[PDB]
From a paper:
Recognition of the RBD by the nanobodies is dominated by CDR3 and CDR2, with CDR1 only making a few contacts. At the heart of the interaction of these nanobodies with the RBD is a salt bridge π–cation interaction involving R52 from CDR2 of the nanobody and E484 and F490 of the virus RBD. As a result of binding to this epitope, the nanobody directly competes with the binding of angiotensin-converting enzyme 2 (ACE2) and thus is neutralizing.
Single-sparticle cryo-EM confirmed that the parent H11 and variants H11-A10, H11-H6, and H11-B5 bound to the same one-up–two-down conformation of the spike that we observed for H11-H4 and H11-D4 (29). The spike protein on its own is dynamic but the binding of the H11 class of nanobodies apparently “freezes out” this motion consistent with the increased entropic penalty for binding.
Author numbering:
A (entry chain B): 922 to 1147
B (entry chain B): 535 to 620, 641 to 676, 690 to 727
C (entry chain A): 728 to 827, 854 to 1067
The structure:
């Protein structure tokens, strides 16, 4: 079942990517931002900045050096400013990318090379494993997680009273279907008969709030009788 | 008064709405300025009257459009302007024109702002207060627990 | 700090105040103006995204049950007061109290209202209290609060029995500590310094931008109207150019600082989102990620342009 659920989910990934382009928006956005910035840089060459012509060749073709220098100076001032603007925005943008890259590297380490207990860090659910796929100017992570599908109400007790002693589950939680008490692990319903090996004994019944009364089976007792 | 006019007091140009002011000008004071050092009050030359200058209403125009692929119908938002100054609905964002206000809350499609989102639905552009999500009351009890009986392996994609 | 004020400056108005002569000169400077507008718009959208990242981490809007039997733990102070107009908790109200144009620069309202952020925090807390960490992972599975705490005690290394036996004491210690939080916030404003600082920085930047309009930059008059009224267009052009050069530089300075400032806020917002996930939606074993001590659980409270986390530790 788990293998089938896994295979199915990978199938859906293929479908999603094949259908909708928007899925890779973050990557596309980065591309678009850099393209717009360069387009702007190129267009600023067409700006006159108060000079007679934006074309540098026109200025020197029309004017002698003393006059030409004034017009060239305006173009230089404008073009240098334009490029400074570009470089500054790129530095800021690069720092945003470096942050993303550091995050991608961190996830590569803690999600692909390991199993993360950090919540949501590797996808919504309880992270199992994750697989990296190269993407243009980016990385894509397929996070396989475990999500509990179907759930049921049970009445629960913090502890049970046996012989005036309080039994708490070693791991797990006490549950009652309504008639019989069992101990199940929290994440998946596997009821087991409450036994001495499923429980540890601390203190007495009196201090524990919400304690219920249920027999705790001892495996050794039958063996002695037999 | 009470109109956007191009005024000129003693060769001081400006465009603004002149209103009778309540400012307590002292006799000598010719005109008032601001926190920002912007002229905002005048004493009339021909009359002993103080007039508050309010800049004529200006605001940004945003066009709310579903893709042109989808529809050519558009809604216009006049940011921070009263509707009088301009399917007309006033939001905290500004005056929204071309969108029908709908009581039913939906997931935000196009964020107009201040909790108000727009979408294209059966067609016309509609404006609604965005729904945060499906309200749920958890069945909390001091003796009740809910334990999952099954699971779903799920693969989700993160792009960086 | 999760977000900043979304601020938009129309440069063609800032640089030239409804003056056509000036606007024509501004055209020669190219698309500088469009680029400035674009930059600021980017920041504003980022601010909305920052808030979504932190607060909208909850599948459904969970509601706490009318009966608050949380095993003696008392959350009335951090849970919303319905009686109040905005459904904000007592602590959120204190936080809101603590934290404290015509030139072409306007403020755009945030996409989520304060009431909506308060609803998101209420959903997170209700999920946390009633269902533990399960709401993050999937469908919120109810678990009694005193038993949820026992799992969190197993998480730090202490056996379940310790919590059960000392339940009254732990509940009292918890309630007391929340009391102290109220007291601290009411007594001293300085506590929300980080949030205040963000506000102050944005205000100073705008104040500077407005003051730079009063600068002449070597023109005869800082007032653009004065130049036009005193001088013929050829002569006026030189003076207007000086004003344009100065005003455009001033605004570029502003935009650049805001881009850098936004990036710092986005980092904080990313951290706030990460703490919402590993601290509120789960129990962090990372040391000092979630308060000093062994983290048990944590509870988010909306604050102006920020989030506040109450970390319960052992
Ligand atoms: C809860 O589960 C227990 C264990 O399966 C049920 O107790 C059993 O009931 C069947 C039918 O009467 C008997 O054949 C078994 O001998 C019982 N087992 C034990 C452990 O005694 C119980 O009936 C179930 N209750 C509900 C509410 O469905
Ligand atoms: C669990 O079992 C204990 C022991 O039988 C119960 O305590 C008895 O309660 C009855 C009714 O109050 C008294 O008459 C006895 O004197 C008590 N015995 C002792 C040793 O205290 C206890 O009430 C039971 N609890 C539940 C949940 O039924
Ligand atoms: C747990 O869920 C899986 C589905 O994820 C269940 O498997 C299905 O079982 C029904 C009945 O045989 C079939 O009609 C479906 O085709 C099965 N689906 C798959 C993907 O195999 C499984 O039975 C569930 N178990 C419980 C506890 O209800
Ligand atoms: C949790 O503690 C708070 C704070 O002491 C209690 O709220 C008070 O309730 C009493 C009435 O019972 C009022 O007189 C106080 O004015 C309230 N104080 C404030 C500031 O809210 C609350 O009732 C306690 N809840 C429980 C479950 O005991
Ligand atoms: C352990 O925990 C705290 C540490 O300060 C103390 O708890 C107090 O215990 C006394 C006596 O039982 C109570 O009257 C007080 O109300 C408790 N105070 C607090 C902070 O809740 C005490 O030092 C130690 N208590 C025990 C039970 O060992
Ligand atoms: C648990 O019980 C409550 C009250 O009867 C109910 O509303 C809820 O749907 C139940 N949940 C499950 C999983 O059965
Ligand atoms: C749960 O609350 C009920 C009242 O709603 C009370 O009678 C009962 O003793 C409590 N039980 C536990 C498990 O503490
Ligand atoms: C002319 O000046 C006097 C000053 O006292 C004033 O009373 C009168 O209203 C003025 N007339 C005009 C043209 O406004
Ligand atoms: C409109 O969108 C659909 C779906 O993406 C696409 O197939 C189609 O080519 C688009 N048409 C136009 C007018 O771009
Ligand atoms: C518009 O003006 C009216 C009348 O003063 C006022 O009640 C209303 O609040 C204003 N609305 C906006 C959008 O400012
Ligand atoms: C939506 O709400 C308003 C009240 O604010 C009301 O006038 C209108 O009838 C409502 N729309 C319906 C019920 O179709």
């Amino acid at each position: 079942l788990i293998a089938n659920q896994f295979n199915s989910a990978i199938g859906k990934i293929q479908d999603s990517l094949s259908s909708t382009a928007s899925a890779l928006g973050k990557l596309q956005d980065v591309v678009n931002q850099n393209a717009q910035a360069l387009n702007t840089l190129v267009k600023q060459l067409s700006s006159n900045f108060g000079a007679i012509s934006s074309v540098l060749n026109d200025i020197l073709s029309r004017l002698d050096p003393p006059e030409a220098e004034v017009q060239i100076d305006r173009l230089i001032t404008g073009r240098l400013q334009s490029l400074q603007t570009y470089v500054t925005q790129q530095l800021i943008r690069a720092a945003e990318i470096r942050a993303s890259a550091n995050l991608a590297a961190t996830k590569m380490s803690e999600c692909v090379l390991g199993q993360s207990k950090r919540v949501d860090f590797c996808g919504k659910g309880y992270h199992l494993m994750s697989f990296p796929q190269s993407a243009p100017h980016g990385v894509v992570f397929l996070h396989v997680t475990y999500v509990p599908a179907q759930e049921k109400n049970f009445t629960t007790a913090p502890a049970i009273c046996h012989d005036g002693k309080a039994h708490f589950p070693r791991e797990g939680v006490f549950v009652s279907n309504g008639t019989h008490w069992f101990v199940t692990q929290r994440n998946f319903y596997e009821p087991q008969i409450i036994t001495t090996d499923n429980t540890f004994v601390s203190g007495n019944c009196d201090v524990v709030i919400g304690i219920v009364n249920n027999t705790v089976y001892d495996p050794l007792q039958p063996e002695l009788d037999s | 008064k009470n109109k956007c006019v191009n005024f000129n007091f003693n060769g001081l140009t400006g465009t603004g709405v002149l209103t009778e002011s309540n400012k307590k000008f002292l006799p000598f004071q010719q005109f008032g300025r601001d926190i920002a050092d912007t002229t905002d009050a005048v004493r009339d030359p021909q009359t002993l009257e103080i007039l508050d200058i309010t800049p004529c209403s200006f605001g940004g125009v945003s066009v709310i459009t579903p893709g042109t692929n989808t529809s050519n119908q558009v809604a216009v938002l006049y940011q921070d302007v009263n509707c009088t100054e301009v399917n007309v609905f006033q939001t905290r964002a500004g005056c929204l024109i071309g969108a029908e206000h709908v009581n039913n809350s939906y997931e935000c499609d196009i964020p107009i702002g201040a909790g108000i989102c727009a979408s294209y639905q059966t067609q016309s552009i509609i404006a609604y207060t965005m729904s945060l999500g499906a309200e749920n009351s958890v069945a909390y009890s001091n003796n009740s627990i809910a334990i999952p009986t099954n699971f779903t392996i799920s693969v989700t994609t993160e792009i960086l | 700090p999760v977000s900043m004020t979304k601020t938009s400056v129309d440069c063609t108005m800032y640089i030239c105040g409804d003056s056509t002569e000036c606007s024509n000169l501004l055209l020669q400077y190219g698309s500088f103006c469009t680029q400035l507008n674009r930059a600021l718009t980017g920041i504003a959208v980022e601010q909305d995204k920052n808030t979504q990242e932190v607060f909208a981490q909850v599948k459904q809007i969970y509601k706490t049950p009318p009966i608050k039997d949380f095993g003696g733990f008392n959350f009335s102070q951090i849970l919303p007061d319905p009686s109040k107009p905005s459904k904000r908790s007592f602590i959120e109200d204190l936080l809101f109290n603590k934290v404290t144009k015509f030139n072409g620069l306007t403020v755009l309202p945030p996409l989520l209202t304060d009431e909506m952020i308060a609803q998101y925090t209420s959903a997170l807390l209700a999920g946390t209290i009633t269902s533990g960490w399960t709401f993050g992972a999937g469908a919120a599975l109810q678990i009694p609060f005193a038993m949820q705490m026992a799992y969190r005690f197993n998480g730090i290394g202490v056996t379940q029995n310790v919590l059960y036996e000392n339940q009254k004491l732990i509940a009292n210690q918890f309630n007391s500590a929340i009391g102290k939080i109220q007291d601290s916030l009411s007594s001293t404003a300085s506590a929300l310094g980080k949030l205040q600082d963000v506000v102050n920085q944005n205000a100073q930047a705008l104040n500077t931008l407005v003051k730079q309009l009063s600068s002449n930059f070597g023109a005869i008059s800082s007032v653009l109207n004065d130049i036009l009224s005193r001088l013929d267009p050829p002569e006026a052009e030189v003076q207007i150019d000086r004003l344009i050069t100065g005003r455009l530089q001033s605004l570029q300075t502003y935009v650049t600082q805001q881009l850098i400032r936004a990036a710092e806020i986005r980092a904080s917002a990313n951290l706030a989102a990460t703490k919402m996930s590993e601290c509120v939606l789960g129990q962090s074993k990372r040391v000092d990620f979630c308060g000093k001590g062994y983290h048990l659980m944590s509870f988010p409270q909306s604050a102006p342009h920020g989030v506040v986390f109450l970390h319960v530790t052992y």
